[PDB]
């Protein structure tokens, strides 16, 4: 069977420094939404 | 100095292009 | 009225408003301040009867 | 998108395989094995728009009892698959596909045919993987959009071939038009966008969702980072968030606003350059349908949406 | 003059030009319009739009509190409302339409629906189809015989079968057709945009047989019990064969109508047979 991705939502420490500062910002960047799903921590943010 | 031109206008409620 | 009596407002709509003359005199109000009544947006001839 | 690209291949050239290992299935009495299995196979599914969802487990069954070797009744004689080993990866492909299939020639005409038939594909997922790679495959191929990934125009190969990349249907004369190819794609996924939010409900499954919400979140995320094609982006942008924007809304609640106070200032300019106004009607619905809910706060219950009701009569 | 003119303006009495419950549905009148009665007594009028993309339905009876529901169409049918059909099959406006890249579009309208409040409609209320390529013979008039069938007429003379198996899935079934042989004369061709011998008018008699008008005003009769040619009439060689000029008819029209066993057939001759 073939590699599929099962994570509701992405740990806070395999994600990247791009990556983590777009889910803590107020507002997105067109063109750098991040592809994994936020985490746990941001859910509010 | 004020000239209202209600005739042609940019549709406010449209995207460009 | 719907969220006194149970019911569920259209989606997207955050939840004792003014009376509608209390909020209308509210904008006439605030323009009043802001042009000062010497403005001829104020011709109390036309606009107290409307 | 090379991490999409890959994973695309996979499935793709991964089912190819399954294109080998059945090749003897394609005698006198063979032959009627061959279509007993196609037949007994894409029935139940055609039915799953068309039943009561107190009888909706007698589809799921039959097709789990047909699928884990249990024999099924298919007209008179009774159907079996057990010391099959080529009917078995037989009865995968041509599920899969009518899957697919339903989703291309049902749930475009009628959409809310999606959600009764993306429970039952999403509970045999759940306890077949292979059909539902096969599912991902087949829905690969013939809707390249919800990979998603936009084919480009190449040279080299003829433009008839190209345009059945795009998912265009094509008869050995003639490719079809663009009316009927929108509503296959949009039926596709949201039928596609159904499966990724539900979940069937009998069984006691302690594990997770086969094809989880969080496939949603990327694939707008992964269509909203590239430049919108004219009218397809706009359209089948609309039918995924009215079918899947509720249950993205509840498991993101501020990320998920975030991406949609973005689409009104930033994307959606972006579509008004790239289309002439007289094929506007995929953008301008997609803005009514943002409208109410920016303002209420709330994305409505996909319209055919599974309630207790429907399990009960 | 026996008769007079009576106008009626439907929304007269409001001063709303325009009733408050109109509903838009979308599918992925001032060019025809028609009055149709259903099983409940009440007429619903539809109206086809200029270009053919829109089509509207509304209560006769009730036209400023009733509901009026506007269908979009993705593009125009091929050859405006004569490749439209509309019918009552079971409580439901059944609404056929070949639109112009070829696809055969069903609509599915509860009669429940048309007469309700709602705005909504659930279930799949459009079918969209493929079933021959229209991009090769061009057709121009879809004509009614029954709930699951219903034949489609062509530009170049032919008429095609178009028969329903489940509920969705329609498939032709061609009729025999040796009238195109006259290309063998000197006076014909297949390639030529002339000589098309089209139908104009057509009428379903005894649900069997299929009385066709063509633009030379033949009456064709066809026979879908034996799916042949029975029998071809030339309406013009009965009155005075004038060789000046006979106008071989150059569109769709209403042409002929009959009663019980009775036919008229219009024949132009000064527009006036």
């Known amino acids: 069977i073939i590699a599929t991705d099962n994570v509701l939502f992405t740990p806070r420490d395999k994600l990247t420094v791009e990556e983590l500062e777009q889910f803590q910002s107020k507002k997105f960047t067109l063109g750098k939404i991040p592809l994994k799903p936020p985490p746990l921590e941001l859910l509010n943010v | 100095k004020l000239v209202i031109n209600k005739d042609m206008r940019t549709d406010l409620f449209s995207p460009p292009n | 009225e719907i969220v006194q009596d149970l019911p569920d407002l259209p989606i997207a709509v955050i939840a004792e408003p003014p009376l509608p003359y209390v909020y209308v005199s509210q904008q006439i109000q605030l323009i009043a301040h802001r042009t000062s009544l010497d403005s001829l947006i104020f011709p109390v001839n036309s606009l107290l009867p409307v | 998108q090379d991490i999409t690209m890959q994973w695309y291949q996979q499935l793709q050239d991964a089912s190819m395989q399954c294109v080998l290992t059945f090749e003897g299935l394609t005698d006198s009495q063979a032959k009627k094995i061959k279509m007993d299995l196609q037949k007994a196979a894409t029935i139940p599914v055609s039915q799953i728009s068309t039943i009561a969802g107190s009888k909706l487990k007698e589809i799921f069954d039959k097709i789990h009892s047909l699928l884990s070797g249990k024999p099924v009744q298919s007209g008179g004689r009774s159907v079996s698959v057990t010391l099959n080993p080529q009917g078995l990866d037989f009865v995968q492909y041509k599920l899969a596909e009518k899957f697919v299939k339903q989703g291309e020639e049902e749930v475009a005409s009628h959409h809310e045919a999606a959600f009764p038939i993306a429970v039952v594909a999403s509970g045999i997922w759940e306890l077949h993987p292979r059909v539902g790679d096969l599912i991902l495959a087949h829905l690969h191929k013939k809707c390249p959009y919800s990979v998603p990934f936009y084919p480009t125009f190449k040279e080299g190969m003829a433009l008839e071939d190209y345009q059945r990349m795009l998912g265009y249907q094509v008869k050995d004369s003639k490719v ?123 994305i409505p219950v996909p319209k055919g949406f599974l309630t207790s009701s429907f399990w009960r009569s | ?60 009876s009730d036209a ?87 034949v489609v007429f062509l530009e170049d003379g032919g008429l095609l079968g178009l028969k329903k198996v489940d509920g969705v899935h329609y498939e032709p079934l061609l009729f025999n057709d040796n009238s195109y042989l006259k290309s063998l004369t000197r006076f014909f061709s297949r390639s030529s945009k002339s000589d098309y011998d089209s139908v104009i008018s057509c009428k379903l008699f005894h649900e069997r047989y299929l009385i066709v008008l063509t633009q030379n005003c033949h009456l064709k009769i066809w026979d879908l019990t ?13 009155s005075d064969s004038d060789p000046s000029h006979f106008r071989k008819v150059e569109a769709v029209g209403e042409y002929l109508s009959l009663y019980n066993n009775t036919l008229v057939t219009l024949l132009p001759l000064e527009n006036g047979l």
Request: glycine content about 4%.
């Open chain 5, 1 to 60: 003059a026996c008769l007079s003119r009576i106008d009626a303006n439907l929304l007269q009495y409001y001063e709303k030009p325009e009733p408050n419950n109109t509903v838009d549905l979308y599918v992925s009148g001032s060019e025809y319009s028609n009055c149709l009665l259903l099983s409940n007594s009440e007429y619903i009028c539809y109206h086809f739009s200029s270009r053919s993309t829109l089509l509207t339905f509304y209560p006769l």
């Open chain 5, 64 to 150: 400023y509190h009733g509901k009026t529901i506007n269908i979009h169409l993705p593009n125009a049918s091929m050859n405006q409302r004569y490749t439209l059909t509309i019918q009552e099959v079971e409580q439901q406006l059944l609404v056929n339409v070949i639109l112009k890249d070829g696809s055969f579009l069903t609509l599915q309208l509860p009669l429940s629906f048309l007469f309700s409040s709602a705005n909504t409609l659930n279930g799949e209320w459009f079918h969209l189809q493929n079933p021959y390529d229209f991009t090769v013979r061009v057709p121009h008039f879809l004509f009614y015989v029954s709930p699951q069938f219903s």
């Open chain 5, 226 to 238: 034996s799916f042949t040619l029975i029998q071809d009439y030339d309406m013009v060689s009965q």
């Open chain 4, 176 to 298: 079809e038009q663009q009316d009927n190819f929108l509503k296959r794609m949009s039926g596709m996924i949201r039928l596609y966008a159904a499966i990724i939010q539900l979940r069937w409900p009998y069984g006691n499954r302690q594990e997770i969702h086969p094809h989880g919400l969080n496939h949603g979140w990327r694939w707008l995320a992964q269509i909203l980072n590239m430049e919108p094609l004219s009218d397809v982006t706009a359209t089948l942008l609309f039918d995924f968030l009215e079918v899947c924007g509720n249950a993205l809304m509840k498991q993101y609640q501020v990320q998920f606003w975030k991406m949609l106070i973005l689409i009104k200032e930033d994307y959606f300019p972006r579509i008004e350059a790239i289309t002439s106004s007289g094929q506007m009607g995929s953008f301008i619905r997609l803005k009514q349908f943002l409208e109410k809910c920016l303002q209420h706060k709330d």
